[PDB]
Amino acid sequence: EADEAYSVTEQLTMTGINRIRQKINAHGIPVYLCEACGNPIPEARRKIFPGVTLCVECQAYQERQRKHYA
Amino acid sequence: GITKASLATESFISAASFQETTRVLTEAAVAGKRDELRGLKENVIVGRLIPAGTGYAYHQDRMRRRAAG
Amino acid sequence: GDDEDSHLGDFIEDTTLELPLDSATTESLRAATHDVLAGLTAREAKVLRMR
Amino acid sequence: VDALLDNGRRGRAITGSNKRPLKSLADMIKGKQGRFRQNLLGKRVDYSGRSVITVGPYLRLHQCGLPKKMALELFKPFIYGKLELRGLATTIKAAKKMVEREEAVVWDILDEVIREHPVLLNRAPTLHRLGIQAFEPVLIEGKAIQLHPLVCAAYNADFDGDQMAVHVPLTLEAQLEARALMMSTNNILSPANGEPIIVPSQDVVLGLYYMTRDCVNAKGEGMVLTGPKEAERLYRSGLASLHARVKVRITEYEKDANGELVAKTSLKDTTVGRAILWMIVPKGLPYSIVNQALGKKAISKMLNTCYRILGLKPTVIFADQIMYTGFAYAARSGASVGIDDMVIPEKKHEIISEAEAEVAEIQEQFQSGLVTAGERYNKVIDIWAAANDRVSKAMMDNLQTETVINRDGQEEKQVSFNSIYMMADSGARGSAAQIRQLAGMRGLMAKPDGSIIETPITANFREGLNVLQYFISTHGARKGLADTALKTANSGYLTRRLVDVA
Amino acid sequence: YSYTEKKRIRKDFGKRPQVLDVPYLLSIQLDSFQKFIEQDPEGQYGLEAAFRSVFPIQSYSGNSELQYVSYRLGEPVFDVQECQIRGVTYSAPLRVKLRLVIYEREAPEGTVKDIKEQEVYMGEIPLMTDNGTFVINGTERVIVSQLHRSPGVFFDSDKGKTHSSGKVLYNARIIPYRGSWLDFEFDPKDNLFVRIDRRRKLPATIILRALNYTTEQILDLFFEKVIFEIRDNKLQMELVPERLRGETASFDIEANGKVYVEKGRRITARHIRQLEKDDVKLIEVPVEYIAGKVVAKDYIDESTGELICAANMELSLDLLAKLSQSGHKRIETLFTNDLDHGPYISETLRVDPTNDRLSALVEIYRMMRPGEPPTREAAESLFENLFFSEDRYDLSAVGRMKFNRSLLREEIEGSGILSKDDIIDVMKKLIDIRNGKGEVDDIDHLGNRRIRSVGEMAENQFRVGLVRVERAVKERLSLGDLDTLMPQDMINAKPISAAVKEFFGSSQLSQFMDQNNPLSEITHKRRISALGPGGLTRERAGFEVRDVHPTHYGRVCPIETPEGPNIGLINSLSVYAQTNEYGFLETPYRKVTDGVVTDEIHYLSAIEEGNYVIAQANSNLDEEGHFVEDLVTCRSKGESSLFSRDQVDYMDVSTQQVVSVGASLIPFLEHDDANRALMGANMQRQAVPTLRADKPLVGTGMERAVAVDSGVTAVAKRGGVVQYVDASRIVIKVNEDEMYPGEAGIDIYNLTKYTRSNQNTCINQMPCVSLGEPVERGDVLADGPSTDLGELALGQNMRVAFMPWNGYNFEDSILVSERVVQEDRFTTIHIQELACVSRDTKLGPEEITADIPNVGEAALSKLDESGIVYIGAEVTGGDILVGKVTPKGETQLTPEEKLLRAIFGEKASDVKDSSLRVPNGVSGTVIDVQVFTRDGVEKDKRALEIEEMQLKQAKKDLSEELQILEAGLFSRIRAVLVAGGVEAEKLDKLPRDRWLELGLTDEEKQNQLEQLAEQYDELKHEFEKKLEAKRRKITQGDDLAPGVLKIVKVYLAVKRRIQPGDKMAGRHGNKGVISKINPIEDMPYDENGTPVDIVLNPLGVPSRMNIGQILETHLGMAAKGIGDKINAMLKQQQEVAKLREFIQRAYDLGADVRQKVDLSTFSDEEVMRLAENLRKGMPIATPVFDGAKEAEIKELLKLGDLPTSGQIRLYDGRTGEQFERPVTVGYMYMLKLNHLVDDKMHARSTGSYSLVTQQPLGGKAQFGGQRFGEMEVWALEAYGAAYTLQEMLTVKSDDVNGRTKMYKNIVDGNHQMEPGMPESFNVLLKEIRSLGINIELEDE
Ligand SMILES: [Mg+2]
Ligand SMILES: [Zn+2]
């Protein structure tokens, strides 16, 4: 008893973090043209995030838009 | 769905256990409904042998005595 | 208390009932009296059963 | 009339001088839910009782410890009967006075009426049919019920003060029903999944593990013994170590014939511990099954195969021996736990400063607009989330094998014998997951929201936590308790709907 | 260092200095009540406050006014002790001065006469104890402080789940302190609605019409005006250069001889910069833009005088022409923009069924009370009473403050009710948030949760007490004759005293004090609840409010909360927390000015705290008090991060201030998983007080604060020396400095001796000082139960060792050595109260006579001639405590009984046996008997002996006071007579009573002798009256209930040892139920032979991540080590030198701590007494987050000469051989909780049965059998257990006929059942058949 309550918490925490973690993937490699609007992707985003397809401008914008509807 | 499936039961005594009791009896009293027991819930209600397990022997042996001569 | 479906009437005990330990001994008091009156003389039984 | 029949389908006639509305005929049948009388609970019931439960490892699996005081009051009509049957009482009214007087003569009578008379033990939320089980009663001085430890799994009983109820099978039918259907030993397999539910729990498995385990070099190294009988002789007298590599003559059996027992004798390469253990295992099992290390996992598959090969009877008495022995050697082992058992990795502070600089990289990039704001959150959360996997599998490499010890020649390393490891590796309690919060850092926590916080708990339990770290740990902890409090109501409702439809 | 510190000093680890010592822990309860009952010559909350609101009361305009003067509190009818035994409530009579004035008819006002009626009595109001409890019926109760939503206005969401569109919604709520709710809410269509209370939703604009606002003023108020000019022919428009933002051009928009923008180009920053800078006031337009515009005011035709267009009517290209040809130059229109200023209020008007003032006032009246007709006088009055009456509505000051606060006003106080402006301004602000400017509140933030406590809640219950008497007073003042009735005739007592008795008696917030433990009491009085009146409900909210909120830091404990159906719905008050002036929760901090940390402290409410940047508790500052590092971990606006040295505005006071008193009592808390910590401070309060008050070897430092601040201990009023020490009382001869000038004398503390608690535990005080010892003010004078030497000792620590012991600790079960039960040390003393009642039944009166039918002298030995058990008689189960008989005549016995009576000659009595007998299984010593007798029934024999003995004891007690107080007072007279006439030997020869005569030469010493005389004769007379009243109270008729003649209460002292079944646990959430009690022969011992007391399971420690219990065990081990060292040296009698050298080394340890110590203590007489108190072990202190660290523990293990491992080798006491591996041994403070087995254990063969349902029922405490509910039936259904089930709900319970048929069969030795039908179902058939339903049993 009670021990299970702790157990429950750990499983939940792990799952939430994991989803978040995945949303970054891993060893990617590609081009530099933004898929939304073609703006220049700097090699900084290429080397920070392996497989980036959204310019910094679009990597805000969309994030921003989602927030607004919340 | 399980909740909907269970809602339909042959024994009216069983229904007045878990369904809304006022409605069950009213709906059932006008119909002149006859409950033959047969099920588990109702036999527990009326306090006789469960028609399964050890009692299955008895209920089976007695159910056949019915509709007979 | 508790607001629970525990109601006053659910605690009112029955006082007219006869508890088995007494219903037991009464069934057994007849037994003893009966055997005591047969182990007597047949006249003393009819005499005592009558008084 | 309407207020009499079903009050409430009007304006709600109230009772005299009393604000509350008066309960009508319809309100006398209806309830929550339906007829109160058939709803839990459920009707109180004569011949019953309860108290706190305690242990009693000395029990056979088919019995239980029942207080003298309770058994006296419970079987009262039986005692009154057997007392006047054998002639010790003139009449029932005398028998009443005798057991009331607690005359010593009665105790010897009670033991007669108790013998082949099962009682029913039932613990709090009755979830499966194993929630009620029938035991043979053993008289106890004390006011607690003694509950055989292997049944604790089925009841989901721990001993934090839980109480159980007793029920006396009155009628002759109820005794034979309780003996052939509800008896402990008749229900050792879960009806949900054919696997044994009477698996050895925790103390008892940690026992066998330490026993059938080997270290590189200890007393008894390499000698050879006539059979299991003299392997114990070697150990009990302190000549051999429990865990030392040893060839001994063993005789295993295999009923591989047409239902017929074949015997095989061999000089098996084993340890003293595993030798002694074979003395329990019944006939037709192979010596291979006890030749391993025996964790909680391997220990239950053993019980399973015993059932599916020899049958109910041999498995039951076997399962008793497993418990008895595991407890005994667990005590001999002297396993314990002190502060120095929870070994932190030597690299911890390093791993932090590295992933701490990783946030300093992604920070520089955020301020300079290389990466966006929501991006940076999910970036930092990964470089912390990684370091925790590094700290976890660092200590676990250190903790697992780093007992480095030597045999006659140079150096060698093996699975650790550190106390807290043996517990997890065996399966007695705790897992590398929970261990990760004792030695390594304990994760990142998240507030009830779910949005995991961007500065993890960098400290662990062997160290202190500080003000903030504990306060962050709070949220996850409280919602944990809060959740499982409601998760009690939810289980109950699902199973209820299912039996209504079945 | 003090006096009861010099006795025994706890070695304190922990580096951070205490800057503010823990205030009175009962501050909250005592403070609040003191405010309620007190003369306040102004409005601040109190009884004065409540009065001033309702008063003055005036008759129905008859100019007969009753005004309120002032009030007094009579002395308590019984004092604390007195009121408890008898069973009265501890209350004082409330006497309030009232003035009745009458105005002539007809009067320019002024009075014919006014009678100034003295203080009419309106009930007694309960009083709070010295220690923060109430007495309601001789039973101590606590009033739990409550947490509810602050009054004011709060804008909330209801995002997401609403409608499954997302969108979100926004609603405003005006929540006043008293009066109806005012709710404003939107919907998806963006229509504003209002609902009073939780009632029927209604279109929002209706309230404006109720305030006498017509359609024109609603447009004017909530909208701007777009002025349309007809200049020349067809339409110009006033253009605000800003209006066009968030819209696209509607036409060819041109002005100033230049086309700025053509049709179809959205008006942005370019166009608005042009218009504003070029000053475009007027532009020419087409007649079609007003096709959508809404006309503002009313415009009528000047000729025909008819209505052209009503206000809030949309124009059309044809509608303009009708009011253009009539000569109307202006047409005012609405500015409608769905991003900035939305056309919201416009749409609402179109949904309103009303039009004028009385039109709306009706729709409000018909909504509130449907079904009955509206009236002109009714509808107008109703609305004015809702939000505008001083009587039926009030926000209070706090409500007005948060109201003004949330609305960005300046005034912090203003109207107490809502105004036409107030309501409008709120509707205004609500709209702003929907527009995107502004954010919503959350219920959870502790700046929007307010704390009420006893003082306030009683005020409110008194206010309602008057409003139901006010109707009555107004009613009498209508018809009241001239100068005959006076302000007492009208005001009844019961109506006032009932409205207040209602609260303290039964309320979710008035409960039996959780009193098994000084921690239990103190943790209860500091408690919060969001449940009950005016708060949330368990079924309502809703996880957000249960969860721990960031604002809880330092106000509410994060860890101490119940573990049940209301988690987070209770919480416990943090240590240093205090209630804001406005009634919010604030906490202490330290003012960081620039880069220095000051010691001037500030209390910051939840709202105040958010703004500032607060440093952390554990922060290193040195020298002047600069921050050591250039960056320090701090928390500011809801989050926590690293901060610059000089940006921090404040800093945490203590490392402790985040937890509760319960939570702070856990040592090495930092090392304990938060969940288990909760269980720890949850179970700590369940610790039953022990026989011998131990002391925690492993402590935290708080134990002294909890012991003292909880009443259980006896704390010195004034410093001085002890004159007399008795196990009964303690007399303190006061020092001169603290001693008052007159009455002189001594402080005399009468001790509480063995007595029943609320939970049947025993609460007993013992003297902790010896004859003639120096004590200073605020010293510990006597220990309560579970307190030692001034420290809080909820249990007894013992030698504990972690290892499997043959399975006798399988789950969390505990294995205990016999040495513990032999040492009677977890033995626990309980006091039950059993009472006997002589009633009146229809057949006759019950007698308490000792003549009991068919009982032998064996019984009547323990009973006196009167029929009451003697004091002091050790009795067990079955012995009769009070003989009693009830009238039951003519039994009508049967033949065989008759024959039996004739054979053995028993005079079959006409009286039943009803005597009070001892419950089976429980056994103890009688320590007290009370008899309460009806006024006017003759006190029997024993009753008269008692009330005679109470008299002799009371006379001895009072005189003892006078004897000590005289001698104490005469002793001062002797010393002042010596100052200017000292005749040392001459003076004390003559009789001391013959001293008062000696005078003194011209000086104040002549006036000083005069002072002691006054207070002597007052002791002489105050003695007399104190003795007189005492005597009357004993003989006076004890008043009882109807039907009851006299009552005997017997008090038992059962001494329960400890046996398998008892729940025990350490402070770290490690529960366990003692499983077997082992012989000392079988215990694990070490090479020195000393067995170990408890054998715990190592498996319980890793899973439940409570690692502090191990640190406790190790430190405890080292703490006993220092003990074992001193015990040897003290037995060696080494001498002060060798001893003091060793003690000094312990209290430093490594360097950097906060402790400080000797050699100041007087190097002999004082130092030796300490050594003694330490030989049992050296008390150490691990503060909560300032705790000891492994190194300090290992270092203290070195000094104790014990291994650093914390582990040793052990030997099995049975086989004698070694245990492989080292095992940990040490000392862990452990509690025995009061789930003691021989309270839980019940059994029943055949017992009582309920009347209504022939069903096993608890009646004589041979309790009802176990309930066999639905789930237990499915159990039997899953087996084949068909018969086991039938018997379970037939003969074993419900079958009135079957149960006896069975029992008879059982004793005949035939196991069968002849079942038949359960009466439960038999009643259903009749219950159904008594409805119109023919329910039969068919066939055969
Ligand atoms: Mg439990
Ligand atoms: Zn882009």
Curated annotation (Swiss-Prot), chain A:
- ZnF endpoints (dksA C4-type): 34-58
Q: Could you tell me the superkingdom of the organism this chain comes from?
A: Bacteria
Entry annotated with the keyword Metal-binding: yes
Which SUPFAM superfamilies does the protein's record reference?
Glucocorticoid receptor-like (DNA-binding domain) (SSF57716)
* Keywords linked to the UniProt accession: Metal-binding, Plasmid, Zinc, Zinc-finger
Output the Pfam families linked to this UniProt entry. Answer: zf-dskA_traR
For this chain, one GO molecular function annotation is: zinc ion binding
NCBIfam families found in the cross-reference section? C4_traR_proteo, PRK13715.1
The protein's name in its UniProt record: Protein TraR
What is the organism of origin for this protein?
Escherichia coli (strain K12)
Its gene name is: traR
Curated annotation (Swiss-Prot), chain C:
Name of the molecule in the record = RNA polymerase sigma factor RpoD
> What is stated about domains?
Contains 4 domains, connected by flexible linkers. In the active conformation, the domains are in an extended conformation, each making extensive interactions with the RNA polymerase catalytic core. In the autoinhibited state, sigma-70 factor domain-1 packs closely together with sigma-70 factor domains-2 and -4, contrary to the extended conformation that is seen when the protein is part of the RNA polymerase holoenzyme.
Q: Where in the cell is it found?
A: Cytoplasm
Q: List the disulfide bonds.
A: none
**Where in the chain is the site Interaction with anti-sigma factors?**
R51
- Say what the protein does: Sigma factors are initiation factors that promote the attachment of RNA polymerase to specific initiation sites and are then released. This sigma factor is the primary sigma factor during exponential growth. Preferentially transcribes genes associated with fast growth, such as ribosomal operons, other protein-synthesis related genes, rRNA- and tRNA-encoding genes and prfB.
Query: Per the UniProt entry, what species is this protein from, by scientific name?
Result: Escherichia coli (strain K12)
Positions spanned in the full protein: 512 to 562 of 613
Q: Which family does it belong to?
A: Belongs to the sigma-70 factor family. RpoD/SigA subfamily.
Name the source's superkingdom: Bacteria
From Swiss-Prot, chain D:
List GO BP terms, alphabetically.
bacterial-type flagellum assembly; bacterial-type flagellum-dependent cell motility; cell motility; cellular response to cell envelope stress; DNA-templated transcription initiation; intracellular iron ion homeostasis; nitrate assimilation; regulation of DNA-templated transcription elongation
Q: What is the effect of changing M395V?
A: Resistant to antibiotics salinamide A and B
Question: Which biotechnological use is given in the entry?
Answer: Co-administration of salinamide and rifampicin or salinamide and myxopyronin suppresses the emergence of resistance to both antibiotics.
Q: Does the keyword Glycoprotein apply?
A: no
Mind listing the UniProt keywords for this protein, alphabetically? Answer: Acetylation, Antibiotic resistance, DNA-directed RNA polymerase, Magnesium, Metal-binding, Nucleotidyltransferase, Transcription, Transferase, Zinc
- Span-the-membrane segments of this chain are none
GO MF terms listed in the record are:
DNA binding; DNA-directed RNA polymerase activity; magnesium ion binding; zinc ion binding
> Could you tell me which cysteines form disulfide bridges?
none
Q: Would you identify the family this protein belongs to, as annotated?
A: Belongs to the RNA polymerase beta' chain family.
Quaternary structure, per UniProt, is: The RNAP catalytic core consists of 2 alpha, 1 beta, 1 beta' and 1 omega subunit. When a sigma factor is associated with the core the holoenzyme is formed, which can initiate transcription. The rRNA transcription and antitermination complex (rrnTAC) consists of RNAP, NusA, NusB, NusE (rpsJ), NusG, SubB, ribosomal protein S4, DNA and precursor rRNA; S4 is more flexible than other subunits.
What is this protein called in UniProt? Answer: DNA-directed RNA polymerase subunit beta'
Give the source species.
Answer: Escherichia coli (strain K12)
Swiss-Prot record, chain E:
What is the enzyme's main class? transferase
MF term (GO), any: ribonucleoside binding
Explain how it is applied in biotechnology.
Answer: Co-administration of salinamide and rifampicin or salinamide and myxopyronin suppresses the emergence of resistance to both antibiotics.
Q: Which processes are annotated in GO (biological process)?
A: bacterial-type flagellum assembly; bacterial-type flagellum-dependent cell motility; cell motility; cellular response to cell envelope stress; DNA-templated transcription initiation; intracellular iron ion homeostasis; nitrate assimilation; regulation of DNA-templated transcription elongation
Q: What is its EC number?
A: 2.7.7.6
Q: Which CDD domains match?
A: RNA_pol_B_RPB2
> Which InterPro entries does the UniProt entry name for this protein?
DNA-dir_RNA_pol_bsu_ext_1_sf, DNA-dir_RNA_pol_bsu_external_1, DNA-dir_RNA_pol_su2, DNA-dir_RNAP_su2_dom, DNA-dir_RNAP_su2_hyb_sf, RNA_pol_bsu_bac, RNA_pol_bsu_CS, RNA_pol_bsu_protrusion
Family, according to the entry, reads as follows: Belongs to the RNA polymerase beta chain family.
Its protein name is DNA-directed RNA polymerase subunit beta
Q: Which organism is it from?
A: Escherichia coli (strain K12)
